Ligand binder design. Sequence first.
Ligand code: HEM
Ligand SMILES: Nc1ccc2nccn2c1
Length: 289
Amino acid sequence: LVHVASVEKGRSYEDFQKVYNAIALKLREDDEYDNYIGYGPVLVRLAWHISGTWDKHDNTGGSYGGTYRFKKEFNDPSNAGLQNGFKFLEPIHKEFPWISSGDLFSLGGVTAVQEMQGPKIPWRCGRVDTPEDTTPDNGRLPDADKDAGYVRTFFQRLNMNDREVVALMGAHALGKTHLKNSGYEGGGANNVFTNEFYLNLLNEDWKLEKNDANNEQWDSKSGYMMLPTDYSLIQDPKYLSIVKEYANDQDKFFKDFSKAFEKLLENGITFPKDAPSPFIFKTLEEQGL
Ligand code: HEM
Ligand SMILES: Nc1ccc2nccn2c1
C-alpha cells in the first residue's frame, strides 16, 4: 500500500506560510478556549491522533489520507475533544480550500508547536485525501491506564524507539486532560512548549490517586498530574535515563522532539526524489506579524 506525496497543484512555500499564518493568527485571536489555554494544545493532539492510527505492517492509517474528516474516525472515543480542533480549522480550510485535509491537520500541529515557542518542525506537503473506505477502524490509539511495556510495544507499530517515545511524550507539557473526554482529571493549563514534562516527572512528589471517574492517575501537591503511561517513563530504567536527559537539556529535547514529530506526521508517506525539501515556517513573531 503506497501513498505518494503529491504537491497541491502549483503551490510552493509561500502558499503554505500563508496557511500557517492564518492558523497562527486565529490561535492568537481565539485566546479564551479551555480556560484561556487556547487551541494550541488540542491542535497538537489532533495532528498526533490523525498520524497515530498508522500501522507500519500494512501502511494503513496515518496522516496521508485525511480520514479524520469521516465519521468513523471523527467519532472514535479516543478522539473525544478533538472536534474542537477540527472546528477551529474549518474556517482555515474554507479560506484555503486547495490544501488537503491531512496537510491541514498536520500543519495545524506544526503551527501550534512553533507558535507556542517550541522547536521549528520541518513540514512537507503533499498528503492527498483518500476515500471513506480507507478510514482506519477505532482502537489504534493508545490506552493511558497501562505500563512502560505497553507503551514500548504500542509505539513499535508506529516505528518509534525509546528515545522517540520519550521525546514525543514531552508534548504532555501542553494543555490538560478533561474528565468528560478521557476519564482523566486535568492539572495545570500550560500553553508554552518547554521541557517541563520531564522536570515535573522528576521533581514532583507524586501520589497515586483515584479520580472521579474511578481511574488511577498520579497527582502532586502542587496540582500537577500524570497518566499512568506518563509515570511509566520514570518506572522503566531505559525511559528514565532519557527523561533525565531531556530534563537537563532543553535544546536536546527540542531537537529530538522536532525530528520525532516530523517523523510521526510523515509516517506512511512516500516522497518522490524530486519532491520539495521540507519547509520551515517562520513564526508570526519572526515575521513581525
Ligand atoms: C502513550 C501515549 C499517549 C497516551 C496514552 C496519551 C493520552 C492522553 C490523554 C488521555 C489526554 C487527555 C485527553 C483529554 O482528556 O482531553 C491527552 C492529552 C494530550 N496529548 Fe496525549 N497521549 C499519549 C501520547 C501523546 C503524543 C505522542 C502527543 C504529541 C506528540 C500527545 C499530545 C497531547 C496533547 C497536546 C494533549 C492536550 C490536548 C488538550 O489540552 O486539549 N499525546 N493525551
Ligand atoms: N495534556 C496532558 C496529558 C497528560 C499529561 N501529563 C501531564 C500533563 N499532561 C497534560
